[PDB]
Every structure is written in structure tokens, then in C-alpha cells.
């Protein structure tokens, strides 16, 4: 059994040298024997590789003392309905130097906000993991033709995540001490969260007694929604996947049974609006 988390999406025909491979699975077949690996003097390391690593397949089901759970129950989400922010990501496919993973392209929220990002990925190199722009193409469908112009209207992720923290703070400062992302088939949204979410123990804001909802890499500080100016990371968010509540078909068909005022304009924010709308109707009626 293998997982798709951290799948090597490069087109390099060989595996990695034992000293460079993060795992036994990724070691080149030349070095494998008796359930172990061997060093073969004369076969050198590769000092120029750039291997795209897939961030699809995260499982947030850890049980660690002092660390809150990201995925909350339906009953805990209802208590925090003020913190609900629907979230959906439309992505693009990795191309040219890599194939096998999706990258965030359009990030939509139930606030009507759409933020476009430069196709960026996590690339393993002989020294480290380089968070950098990668070649990408929109999905081949005609229902995704609106994504073609977006491939050149994107912002670098350092800017994008500052905008997300800013939008969430403006929206939630007078509503909640949390954010609950309301999702539908959470997989890709959770992948996107790797680009702007940080987790850890419950902390307090540096300027007040309210719990921390933001983090700053520049200063290694934490802040609430009121004091988050310049902060780049969403800290300790909560979330729930509406799709896992027993629904049969797609998002729009389940949404349309209770609501007729949120039409499908096909953009990420419309799916985010529909997700939060469906969650409110299913939970409070």
C-alpha cells in the first residue's frame, strides 16, 4: 500500500540515490536488495534535479495534547455558525517538467472574493524543497474555459495569503474568535490550505487577551482578527466537509433543493457561497 501524499510528479526515469531519497520507496531500484538499500561506490548523486512533490492527500486526523483538531463535528460547527466562511479552490494541472498534481489557481470565499494565484509548487532539489512557480495548464474542459485568462492574472503566494488573512480579519473581527471553512469534497481545499495555514497549540494575541487566529513569519508573532495587520498566515483554523453529511449528488443539485437565489456563475466564490448556503439550510431547518 502506497499513498498519493508527496507523490513524485517529475518525468525523471530514475529513482533517487539512497542519501537523497526521502523514503525507501523513492530510492532507485538499482540500490534495492533484501528489503534494504546498498551504497554503490561509483554511482554518484544527482546534483541538478528539480522534482515536483504532490501536496494532494493530507489527513488531518492527529490526536495531540494541546493541539486543537482542524476538522470539527457538525454540532460544534452549528455553535460557531458566525465563523462560517465557505471556501472552494479551482485548480490547474502541473505540466512540462512535471505531471500528476493540481496547483491552486482561483481561491473563492462565501464573501464573494476570488483571489488568483501564480501556479506555485513544492519542488525537491538536492539541498532542500523550493516553493516556486511551476509550469501549469488549465483543466481541458469547456466548463473551465474561464480559467485560461487567469493563468496570467495571478499574484505571488506571499501577496495572496496576506489578502486572505486581511479578508478574514475584516469579515470576522466583530463576529467570532475563529474561522470555520465550510467545504464540499475538501481534498483540494486542504491542499490549498498548505499555502496559507499554520497550526500549533492554542495561543493568545500579542496585543490583547483574545485567542490567536493569525501568524506572522516576519516577526514570529500571533494575532487575533483585530490586530492582524501585515500578518501572512491563518493560524489554527477550523473546517467541515458538507459533502460527508450523506448527500447523494453534486454540490449544485443539493444546494438547489433548498435555494433558488445563488445561481452557478462557475467561479470558485459561487461554489463557496453555495457550500455555506447548503450548510445553513441543512443544519438549521
Amino acid at each position: 500500500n502506497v499513498t498519493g501524499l508527496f507523490k513524485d510528479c517529475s518525468k525523471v526515469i530514475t529513482g533517487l540515490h539512497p542519501t537523497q531519497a526521502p523514503t525507501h520507496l523513492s530510492v532507485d531500484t538499482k540500490f534495492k536488495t533484501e528489503g534494504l538499500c546498498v551504497d554503490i561506490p561509483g554511482i554518484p548523486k544527482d546534483m541538478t534535479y528539480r522534482r515536483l512533490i504532490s501536496m494532494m492527500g493530507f489527513k488531518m486526523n492527529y490526536q495531540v495534547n494541546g493541539y486543537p483538531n482542524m476538522f470539527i463535528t457538525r454540532e460544534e460547527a452549528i455553535r460557531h455558525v458566525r465563523a462560517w466562511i465557505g471556501f472552494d479552490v479551482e485548480g490547474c494541472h502541473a505540466t512540462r517538467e512535471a505531471v500528476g498534481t493540481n496547483l491552486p489557481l482561483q481561491l473563492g470565499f462565501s464573501t464573494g472574493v476570488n483571489l488568483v494565484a501564480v501556479p506555485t509548487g513544492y519542488v525537491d532539489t538536492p539541498n532542500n524543497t523550493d516553493f516556486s512557480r511551476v509550469s501549469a495548464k488549465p483543466p481541458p474542459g469547456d466548463q473551465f474555459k474561464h480559467l485560461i485568462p487567469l493563468m496570467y492574472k495571478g499574484l505571488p503566494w506571499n501577496v495572496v495569503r496576506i489578502k486572505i488573512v486581511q479578508m478574514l480579519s475584516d469579515t470576522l473581527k466583530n463576529l467570532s474568535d475563529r474561522v470555520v471553512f465550510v467545504l464540499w469534497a475538501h481534498g483540494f481545499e486542504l491542499t490549498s490550505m498548505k499555502y496559507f495555514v499554520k497550526i500549533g497549540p492554542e495561543r493568545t494575541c500579542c496585543l490583547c487577551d483574545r485567542r490567536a487566529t493569525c501568524f506572522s513569519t516576519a516577526s514570529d508573532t500571533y494575532a487575533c482578527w483585530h490586530h492582524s495587520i501585515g500578518f501572512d498566515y491563518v493560524y489554527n483554523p477550523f473546517m467541515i466537509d458538507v459533502q460527508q453529511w450523506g448527500f447523494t449528488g453534486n454540490l449544485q443539485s443539493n444546494h438547489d433543493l433548498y435555494c433558488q437565489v445563488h445561481g452557478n456563475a462557475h467561479v470558485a466564490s459561487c461554489d463557496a457561497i453555495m457550500t455555506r448556503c447548503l450548510a445553513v439550510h441543512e443544519c438549521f431547518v
Binding site: 500500500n1 502506497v2 499513498t3 498519493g4 501524499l5 508527496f6 507523490k7 513524485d8 510528479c9 529513482g15 533517487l16 540515490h17 539512497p18 542519501t19 537523497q20 531519497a21 526521502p22 523514503t23 525507501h24 520507496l25 523513492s26 530510492v27 536488495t33 533484501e34 534494504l36 538499500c37 546498498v38 551504497d39 561506490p41 548523486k45 512533490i53 504532490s54 492527500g57 493530507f58 489527513k59 488531518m60 486526523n61 492527529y62 490526536q63 495531540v64 495534547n65 494541546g66 493541539y67 505531471v99 500528476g100 498534481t101 513544492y122 525537491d124 538536492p126 539541498n127 532542500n128 524543497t129 490550505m193 498548505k194 495555514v197 499554520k198 497550526i199 500549533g200 498566515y233 493560524y235
Partner: protein, 131 residues
């Protein structure tokens, strides 16, 4: 398309550490909460007639150690996250790490908690003869 690098047993620990602000503290806390150590490391088949040095260009395990590929013993490499040194480069990746056999069940945790003597090249507390 693509070639997998991971097994399902590591999904929870790597997902948790890949999102943390302090990944080192997150791993130590994960182990303290009963979590299983990171598995799927690159363990080497070697003669065990090595020098016993901690980080080497070839496997140097002695009779009381196990040799591993350095990238597979590094939490930062395993999670594909930033390395904590200012240059952002790895000190284990590209080399072989010798772990005492008694600690070989958790080579990622061993390299996270221990330090190598910059004089004799052996791990402090596990081979470093000098004080």
C-alpha cells in the same frame, strides 16, 4: 501519473508536521502523545565494520549502529518544509547517518533530539568519548 514516495502509515504524522509553525516541536509532541515514529526510512545493508562517525559520505555503521540515508532521517526533508538554518540547506541530505541500534526505531526523532560533536564526529551521549 507520477511515482508514490509514501506509505499510508506516515500520512497523519507528515500532514501534522507539514502544517505546523514549529515542526520539530510538533514531532516531539506527536511522539509524546503516543504517535508512532516516522517509518519508510532508507536503512542500509552494510558490513558494520565502519568508523562509527555520525554523518559520513559512505555508510560507516559499526556493530552498535544502523546506517541510513540522511534525507530519510530529516524531518524537514520528509515533510518538504523549510530547513531551520538561515541558508535553508540540509546538513543530513546527501550524506549517510549512523544511528545507535537501540534508537533505530525512530531515526527522524534521533537526529531531531541529538547533536554531533564538532571535534570527534560522534553523537553526544552515544560515542563521543571527550567531555
Amino acid at each position: 501519473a507520477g511515482n508514490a514516495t509514501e506509505v499510508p502509515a506516515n500520512s497523519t504524522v507528515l500532514s501534522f508536521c507539514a502544517f505546523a509553525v514549529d515542526a520539530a516541536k510538533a514531532y516531539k509532541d506527536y511522539l509524546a502523545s503516543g504517535g508512532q515514529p516516522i517509518t519508510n526510512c532508507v536503512k542500509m545493508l552494510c558490513t558494520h565494520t565502519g568508523t562509527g562517525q555520525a554523518i559520513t559520505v559512505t555508510p560507516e555503521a559499526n556493530m552498535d549502529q544502523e546506517s541510513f540515508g540522511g534525507a530519510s532521517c530529516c524531518l524537514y526533508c520528509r515533510c518538504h518544509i523549510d530547513h531551520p538554518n538561515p541558508k535553508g540547506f540540509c546538513d543530513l541530505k546527501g550524506k549517510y547517518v549512523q544511528i545507535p541500534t537501540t534508537c533505530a526505531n525512530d531515526p527522524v526523532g534521533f537526529t531531531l533530539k541529538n547533536t554531533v560533536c564538532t571535534v570527534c564526529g560522534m553523537w553526544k551521549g552515544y560515542g563521543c568519548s571527550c567531555d
